[PDB]
Amino acid sequence: TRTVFVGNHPVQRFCDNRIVSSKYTLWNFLPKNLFEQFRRIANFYFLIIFLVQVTVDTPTSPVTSGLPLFFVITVTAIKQGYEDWLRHRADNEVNKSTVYIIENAKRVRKESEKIKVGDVVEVQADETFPCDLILLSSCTTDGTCYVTTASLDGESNCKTHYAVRDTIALCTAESIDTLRAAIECEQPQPDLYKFVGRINIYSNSLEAVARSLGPENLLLKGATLKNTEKIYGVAVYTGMETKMALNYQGKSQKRSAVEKSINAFLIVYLFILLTKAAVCTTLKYVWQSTPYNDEPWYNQKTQKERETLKVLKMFTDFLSFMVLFNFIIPVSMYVTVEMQKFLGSFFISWDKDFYDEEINEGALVNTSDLNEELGQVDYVFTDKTGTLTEKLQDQAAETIEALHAAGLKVWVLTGDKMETAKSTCYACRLFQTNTELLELTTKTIEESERKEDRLHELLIEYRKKLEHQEYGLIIDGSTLSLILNSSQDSSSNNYKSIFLQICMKCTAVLCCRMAPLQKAQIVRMVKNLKGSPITLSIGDGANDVSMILESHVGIGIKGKEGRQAARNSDYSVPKFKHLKKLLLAHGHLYYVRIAHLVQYFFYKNLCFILPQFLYQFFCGFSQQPLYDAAYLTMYNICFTSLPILAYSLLEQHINIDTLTSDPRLYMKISGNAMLQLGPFLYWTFLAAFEGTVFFFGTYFLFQTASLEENGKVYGNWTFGTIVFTVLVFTVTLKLALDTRFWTWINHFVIWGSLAFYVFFSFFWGGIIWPFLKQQRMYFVFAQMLSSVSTWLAIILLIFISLFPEILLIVLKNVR
Template sequence: MHECIRKTGIKLGLRRPPLPPQRDIPVGPVSKLDFVSPEYSLKKLYGDNEITTSRYTWYGFIFQNLAEQAQRIANFYFICIAVVQIFTDSPVTPAISIIPLVFVLAVTLVKQGYEDWLRHRADREVNHVRVEVVTEDGRLKTVRAMELTVGDIVLCRVNDIFPCDMLILSSSEQNGECYVTTASLDGETNLKRFVAPELTRMYDSPDLLAKNLRGKITCQQPINDLYAFNGRLKVENEVGDAEVCPIGPSNLLLRGACLRNTDFVYACAVYTGQDTKMALNSKGKKTKFSQVERRLNYYLAIILAFLVTCSLISSILMFALPLKNAWYIQPQMITAWSVVQTFLGFIVLYNYIIPISLYVTIEVQKFFGSLFFEWDINLYDKNLNERAKCNTSDLLEEMGQVEYLFTDKTGTLTENLMQFRRFATALGTFGVKDGKIYKILPDQRRRSTLVGELETLFGDVVDLTPSTSLSEEPSDADLLNSIQTLLLVLSLCHTVRVEKNLPGEEPTTGKHKKKKRGAAASSSAAATTAVIDTLQQFREPPRRGSSALRRASAAQSASAAVRASRRGKKVKAEEYIYQASSPDEKAFVEATRDLGVVYHGVDESGIHVVTDHGLALRYRLLDVLEFDATRKCMSVVLQPFTPGSQLDEEAPVVVLCKGAETAMLPRVATDQQVSTVPHQSTDPLVSGLSGRLRTEISMTTEEAMNQVTEFASSGLRTLVMGAKLISAAQWYEMKQELDTARGLLDNRDAALAAAYAKIESHLTLVGCTGIEDMLQDGVPETITALREAGIQVWVLTGDKEETAVNISYSAGHFFVGMSEARITRHTSLRSCLDALNAQWERMKEAKRIDASQQFGIVIDGQSLNFALEIELRDKFVEFCQGASTVLCCRLTPLQKAEVVRLIKESRSPAPVTAAIGDGANDVSMILEAHVSFGLYGKEGRQAVRAADYAFGRFKFLKSALLFHGHTYYKRVALLVLYFFYKNLLFTLPQMLFGFFCSYSAQTIYPEVYMVFYNITMTSLPIFLFGLFEKPVPEHILLAYPRLYRDIVRNRCLSLINFIVWITLAVWHGFVIFFGIYFLAFRGQAGGGSDPVSGYGGSAVGAILGFGNLLIMTIFIVTNLRVYLFSYYLNWVVLLGNVLAFLLNLSMYTFLNFYLFPLETPAELFATWSVLWGGSGLGTPWFAFPVLICLSLLPDLILRAFTDQGWKWRLAEMQEEQEHMETEPKSVVLNGTSVTHNVRQTDVEDSLKEQTSSQSQSNNALREESFLS
């Protein structure tokens, strides 16, 4: 049966057939026509390319959404109440419960329907993107992206987004390469190089692809690893023989990536739709519940228990109490069904104690609150032209509960803007600034200096011109040669592409010049035409465009530089556009250009050109060993160019390598391992790496490690440069082994690793470099404010220990007077345990001596693995909680998430965690935290999409947490308490009335009030309060971050506050009920008869008049109560209260008098007439002022106390602020005294403003003492 259903589903297209272990994909339109599957077509087997992120369909939306809403406890409860009213003898009509329930469900349905409509619209935009596909007759056909199937050949133009995962077949480049940005996938905005297999590079037009290409791709089934792809490509040649070549990650273009700096590519669809790597990595976010919602459910359970108890007691009393003078009530037989029916009747009667509109009010308020968050001008980044973004509106109040903040470093605390600042060779340490090299002062060479203070160490300028290099002092010549060799390595060891703006084209880098007009413009056009004419010799189809032209322009400039050098003319440093796959490489090439060593790219003959102060150097690129995370380095293999030969068997081959010190230092050659290449060369790079010069300029591993540590201590990103010379014969042997490894279909990675290790061994250390990543503006002030707010900040980074520590000091994460506790470089569980115990005892001893002593913990990824083990987990958590701040360095993305999870599980209830990052490597941490923030940065938008909230700068976090978090939490907390209060106040008189009606389940209110009490009578004022209330002015919250501590751990919704609000509701209920009862019982309304209603005597004496006066008093008290806990009254809130009264009065009169007249005509209207203008007018005019003042008297007293408490508190904070001083202090870092400037938040203006407007400030924050 199951198998029959499965096959039927497959035939109908509802289910996909089982996938084979590997997929075979036809390549080319003809091959696709020839594809024959035993059972299924390609579309049925692999699906189409449609992406669906929406939750509902148009035909099932209402039913599915209502089913989901019924799963919410409150909604399910009210549905049950409505069912009970329909099928039992209910004391009120079913409409009383059904109308509010329908209203709440309808509002939620509309809200979620709108959100899903937005998802449908986004899906439509993605699925309906126009894509060009090669047809069988060699033409291009435009189809929608969703119509693509596996095997289609797609044309993508420059700046196009790839519609699916595709194998590149050919490109506009002769060597089949293309450049891509994968920011939407892995967060990296740098260019990545992909290349077409050699078997298909020649098929670069639709005609060739349709007529000549026949092939098949055999590859693995889709997996979510972005960098894993293996398979083989089989292509039939002209004579019908099949050729096979391996394919890998460098051949696969991923969906969501963008084509850059390449005019076009042709690619074959391999994975489509939900099988793409982007879809497989798009995990749905976990459903997050705020602390307010958790506490709300807890209090809701308490109220439900109270409701059941009261209903049970009322049921017992109904049968137990005798009926006196109740001749109109028929005695009821006590049976099981009558007991159940009575109990359910009281449940229905008292069910208004549960606030049915609470959830929908909170949802709507959060929706508008998210708009206010996005519209906040203080969260707008004018540099990026980006405003704040809310990906969810459910966690606004959670920003006010954060106890731990986990932050990335690079791009989050820093600018991710790299500048080449320092380098070291065997003969000295140097600084770089403004195109000049400075000697580091000898007496300060070992000094650790913070980022931003590097220039204080600079000494004399080093002149690199050729005349200076001929100094009579050998040591000076060796010094310059060592610098020259390192600069040449930096200018050649990379994968940078060079472009140049065309004549007349607006420059994209460098200084912008005004456009020429007239004759100059015509000459520019002529020059452009000349460039285009020159390009006719290149292999370009008609669609090749500006990218190729800019590269051709750069190639012409490179050739011109060579010609100028030969003639002895000055070579201009062109304004090239450097396109780099790494920000470090771009920083190196731009810096060496400013220093006189200019990388021109490839000339018109494909040879790489570098000019060293006018001297043209040409190199043939033999191979590139790309960077990977396992090796942690990359290499290029070059040979000085000899015209007229492909590979000069005489000339040496140069291997240039750069990487992390952990990867480079083990590859350094000993004296016995240094290869000697007997070759005389005038090339400065070759001469610098051979003979005596190699010995003089090579660094030892100890020197390199010391320099790396010194640079890292200055907060710089470090790399180590190595090189070696080998003979052409040696390279030919290595190249054969490398090509063999690349051609393997099985065990390719292991073979490549062995080949790489052989090439990159026995290196000479040329030098090491330090690149500065600038600190973002406002970071120290923000971290200091968050620490004062009681938020423990953890920095989680993949950087080196010393770099991370120094950035922590400059960012204010580590501060003056704090002791460091380092747990690093441990290789076993025992050593990590011993270090943890030692540091723990040291911390306890220090705090015993001085309780104010602060500690900062530093732990690296290797030691963290042991600290997360079950044996050390609890001790490590306790150790970290006792510290002021924590720095975790050398972490992987998975370790970042594990650290967040560790703190979340450290206690119950869990502390609220927040995470902030800007790159794809931060997504796991972002998804793990309770509330998360993404930064618009240079590492793509994946963090922005994964986060709950996003903005442009780290400093905006201060306003987001201290102001928005504080404000939204207070709003929602007060709203929750108010809803419980007003519903208990409404229900309590009904419970009290039971004693006077022998618990006969008689309603005291007219039914129309029971319908609209939660919908219209009490919803508008509190809703407007929730939108506009500001418990504390923004400038005070930002000036006094310590105020944030008063609301964390859900203090505003503590059990004590809940009891206070419930007690006030009980007081108000008793005062109002018995006050009006006293007036009615004593006949204070007077006698008489009203001709309209027909009632005689006191109108209040009748139950209808009693209920009317009761509900109106409750209505006024509950709405006035809003003003007593509000501190930001504006005309909108005031108008809301007035409208609530007038609109309800008008609505009730209209409904009852004109639409729903009762048996007694216009019953409610008549009662109101008697109460306000008849013989009983004394009752309301006397009851309202007296009862309202008496019931609100405790609230007024509490308000007075909280106001006075805030005055004392403000004075105390001002006094503490006056004693805060800013002064330089010294701290010992790695045995070196480093001067830091203590940065404090500037609050002088705020203090003056508070002093001048004391009365206004006294109206702020008074609620703090009341709720706390």
């Protein structure tokens, strides 16, 4: 509640029309982004290991460990910078707009950010209003102004507005000549059209004005002056303080369900890694408690080692086990996921089905981070006037039926009025003829007493039903405001909770007179309902930007209204019937590709490290790596990363055309099925079982004198390679069984990665080059390969390790 003066001469803490929506400052983007990014437990763990690794012990070259960590941070830095750079450009586009105002009865030209409270602004025909303004003088008769409130409510029709009655006759002859008007106004509030004001216009002579400003007098920011000549507006509210702004709520970024499961899995293996390291250190000193176990006569410690504190040695020893098994958490998985979303997003753009020949424009992907998000959608929120209708789209009715058969509850939240909105819902097959409606509208709502009355009686009669296709709910803008805002009075039975109980078991929900911020609130309240159901918001208007940004994934249709919704939205499609192909076909495939991608990496590295952990028991607990230094490094780089990489890019779990044929298949992966506790726990035990077979299978093999006809014994580097050879062959062949869509690239990558391992081992092992201080792996692979017994054992261990997998696949066919 402040006082606004038209003349500003009565007888940037507060934004004077300087609006900025950028999350990060261009000057301090790097320190802010890095500090927030390192806050994540996943990224902090990668950094801390790198600093420890160089400091105390390096099982592999530190260059290999830190570089992808430096890579993954840079890629995220580009993505956060690019998204921020768009916001500044959009803010610049709005700010750098020519606007004309009257200063000292002189017309001058300046930008939007210069306009301040109480200023008189001359708004010409067919130009958007810089800020919400009181209508004082119009040269047109009776001060009748028509505006199309396209941005405010997504509808484009003329809205009548009236100038102040004393100044309606004021033409373009110095209307504001040192005006002493003192407008007293309320605080800026997000009630859209609703407004109360107390105007006090006093000329040089004594005058008394008791006029009360109303919705018709005030013109809201963002509207388009249509079929109206030049008018004069006073900025009673300026800048952020508008009904067009402060409904954005800023941007809270987008978080996906799969990325939530990655962090949930990463913290589990971080605890296993702590357990693995802790048990080794505890068992190590118990084992070394014996006088001769530590420093026997053959190997003796140096003088530097002797002169160290026991507590200090324990700390570095614990970290030595930590850095040894740090391969449990795969850095390559974060790099691969980064690339999988980058290359995987282009498939949507290249799709011909997302091309509308009528407007000759195709779908695009603004945000590539939420490719997997489309496969988990179970709540859909549409626009209606723009998206659903145009009347109905070519396949608008068929699309709604497809979503319902796919287990997606679809909603038709619109800002359109009640009278015309109910007509469409019957036509679009959403509301069948037999469905009666629970019209919680202003016609059926009277003051506070009937508020709980309607809610409780629904709790009595409507709740008792759970037929299902008989009850449909209708809410209005005023009713929804009371339900959400004024629900805090009842603690025992909150009106929000009872409302959510109503909506959870309805065939459809149709809302009317919804302001853009209300669309965010209703979507937000659904989000906080017995967990976090995945919501999809689709809209094609400047008002829909609030709900599109509020939901998890936003789809922005590019229509006659404009491209305001498209640019902020994660994805854009030209027709509503394309929503079926988007989330059913692409959404299902995108999730299944990455869900199996995540589970494979964690399974892959557990088989990598578990034999290394078991080898500590047979070793002296001295953090002795079972594999060569080169083999440890290249396991994640070039050996096994490429097979799963090509799998994620192009793999159809079910035929892409078949997915659209039967929309029931989307229900299989609805509840994060592939990343649930069930499938995850099986993946870990399968990795643990394969790890045990790899080591102890070789351990019992090495119980003989020799494995060659020449009777030559084999070293520990032969023991490492035998385990590693089984490891690479099993893990890669495990992916082959999973893959059911074999392409030429998939054939080339899978079999090529196996052949590369054999080739590289021969190349690395067999040629001496004078730049390694150690030549442990000289001829081990060829000697390992040159034994008949080793060949038989390797084929055995591959089949035994794959026996639980092959048993499950055959069993899955029956019952």
